[model samples]
Target: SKIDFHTHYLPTSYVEALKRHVPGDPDGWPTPEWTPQLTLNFMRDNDISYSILSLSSPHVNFGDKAETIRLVEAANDDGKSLAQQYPDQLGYLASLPIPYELDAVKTVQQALDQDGALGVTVPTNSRGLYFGSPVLERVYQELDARQAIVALHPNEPAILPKNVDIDLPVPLLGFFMDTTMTFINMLKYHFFEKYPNIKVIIPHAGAFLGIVDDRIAQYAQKVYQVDVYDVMHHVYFDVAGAVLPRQLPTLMSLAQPEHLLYGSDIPYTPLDGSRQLGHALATTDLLTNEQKQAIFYDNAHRLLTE
Candidate 1:
């Protein structure tokens, strides 16, 4: 089965809620052009067997915490319902309202208890708290106990440096940096140490970290006092927008092919992106057919199945 491990969807009710607050574009991220039909059609055209959907970055962060919690609840309900409607085509990654530990824990339990929820999806950073914070220990413990998949996508940080130019998709740069930082912090704090069995899938080829694995290892060990290799051994990276054939070997060298999974940040990027990703996987001279199959489907299947 072809599985795109990282994809996004918005709840209609959540969109309506945003409209009631912000009043114009209901879905906060992306151009208002993305619709459910557009998303599903893209998946179908690209031969995606399953697209595990979650809320995109900057997820309901601008609203009040109470309001954000409500939006998250609505998204969980809508995402779960949609997955149920298309069981073979979709799976859901529940959204958690961070910086509100109690609500985060509660919502995660509720979503997992609901059918069609494969796991929880979280941004690299949420309202100034990185995904690896001590406050999230309870949630991590719960997920670990359930052997749940944890999909970590990138997001714009709460604060950006003043000197950086505001123009250009700052989110593109910020999001990658945020993911790298959060992953490193998690290693430093040994968050994964306690929850050893919890599976983590990091998007965008581990967001710059995969390419700079040596630097990450040095920094983590010397600067952060963490064993980088130990942490990396347990995590997986999804090649979404980073599937250049020439670069694949280097990424595979950093983490085995089994640690790599197929992902398409669809609707945000063109549909053809998924096809290109598949082609990249096929052409990459680094792996045997078995490895390629693992990256394309087996690894993700194992994750969701667990």
Candidate 2:
């Protein structure tokens, strides 16, 4: 069974509470009404064995840090209960109440130890504050010490550019670009050097990493004074939202088969889209049968269960 690393759930109460902010959907995209049944059906139809779920962006940060804390706790409890109900089919990453440094630290450990979360999912920026800020440094320290599994998700970056207006959906570019920038920040901050143990999975096939890594790689050799590949090797990339021939080449160029994982990005991308994406990936000549197997199942199995 395939392990789809990227998925979402709108907890009953949380959805109801977030109506004013999210108002049916956060990104203004219509979301399929999600239920455990709908999710399971998608998994069955798509041949997904298990799904790793988490809360998406605008995550409980409604202009109030304390409110973020409350919502974060509520979401984690819902995740735990779902996993307990379908232990084999469901596993989830804890959602951190970001920009709230102290609460963020507490929730990470609590979710992992008590709720048995596979890892924690964090937005690229929380409440417009990116990961490298002084406020978030405390979170990095704790996750590093724990050697935690961290899944990276995208959001509106801390400073969304001074003057730019676009009518297109943010996910079209904003999400991918933010994932790239924050990842670079992780390297710039020497998180890899400082917290060598934490395992990171960059979503959307490293977002813009495949395109940006060359420049970063050269800088690392010339002036950045770092081994770029050595740092990247410590983390993994999930092939969600990227299954075409062109996308595969770029992603694999940046990461090896071992560092590749599967993610459906479901509900956001929808089950039909995922099915098409999966087929596109499985049939590609660029990836070997073994690599395909690793991407779809074996690698995730090792990451989650090993």
Candidate 3:
């Protein structure tokens, strides 16, 4: 059994709220119906010892801060309840009302106070405020003080590029690009250096970052006056999406072995697809069994427990 670092659970309330705020399929992907039983089944079948649930893209924010606060609280409470119920098999990463630093900080405090709340899932960019935006400096400080685990999930960018408008679901390609943009922005802002205590988990195998790592590293060193590789070493990467035969190798080229983690991206990627990818990751020769054990469970255990 392994520990899953990237997974999602949408409370019925959150789903209903999405309809009110973002009608007809948020992020161009139909919301998958989820229940604790469904999640448990996935975990059991996939040999996942424990799973950390988080709210996925098109997070708990729309335009209304009040409603966003309500949704964020409710979702965190819902996840808390599940974790309490399962105790051993389930845990959750809290959701926050981003772009509102005060509410976000309070939410982080409130959620982390719970027993099963392992960390927080920060949107790559929420309400046009990217993760590295100066507005979130206080939030980062608070998280840093607590030594928080931040699982970064991508959302639809504020402005989709027209040149690459292929009219597909944002998850197909845009999600990767969004995550990549946030990584570059973080380097530009020196977020890792500023918040050394916080552990960040970059999903989708660091998205397109490995491909453009040299580009970003070169430009970031010259323009932002930052060390890209040094910043990256402080962060963690999850093997989610199609990370086999291609993506994983590129990610491995830059990722520290201990910083690599296993992620199913379940309930969003569909159970069968997730299983296949999980199997692929397990069987691949790219990592030794010792390294795989670290990625599958040990690393996350240390990150959350320590």
- In terms of lDDT, the best-performing candidate is 3
**Candidates 1 and 2, the one with greater TM-score:** 2
Candidate 1 lDDT, tens digit per residue, 191-296?
A: 7777888788888877777665686777777876767766666788888876575555666666755677888787566667666766777777767889878978
Q: Which regions of candidate 2 are displaced past 4 Å? A: 22-25, 159-165, 221-224
- Candidate 3 pairs with clashing backbones: none
Residues 114-180, candidate 2: write the lDDT tens digits: 8789889998887677765667878888888777888888886555564675444567778888888
State each model's C-alpha RMSD to the native. 2.8, 1.9, 1.4
- Find the 10 residues in a row with the least total lDDT in model 1: 23-32
- What local distance difference test score does each model get? 0.75, 0.80, 0.86
Candidate 2 at 60: error in angstroms?
A: 1.8
Clashes of 2: 1
Error of 1 at 267 (Å): 1.0
Spell out the clash pairs found in candidate 2: 128-158
